[PDB]
Ligand SMILES: [Cl-]
């Protein structure tokens with residue numbers, strides 16, 4: 477599913493992400509934009525052979541099981557394919573664990589490089605919510 481911007485903001489809000497660990501809704505929307513272009517089916521292989529999955533490109537090295545990432549964990553206790561669903565519940569629940577792990581949204585390198593220090597509120601500007 478490719479979310480609209482305001483549609484994704486609203487789904488994230490409903491799942492308790494606006495201001496989760498202090499990170500306003502625009503932070504999450506912006507991260508999603510640059511991680512997946514709002515496509516729940518996005519997958520990308522990493523150099524290390526781990527894979528990033530879904531709207532927030534959650535990585536198989538620590539967070540989900542895909543069966544092909546040697547020496548990995550599955551700290552969200554989820555198959556990585558659950559992160560590709562049209563329903564973002566699994567991605568949001570697992571993002572909450574990630575952003576609580578000590579480095580906040582710096583866990584997302586694309587958030588650090590493309591969202592952090594920007595007018596992230598622009599990502600939810602105009603949205604009803
Ligand atoms: Cl915001």
Ligand SMILES: [Cl-]
Pocket residue numbers: 497498579580581
């Ligand atoms: Cl933080």
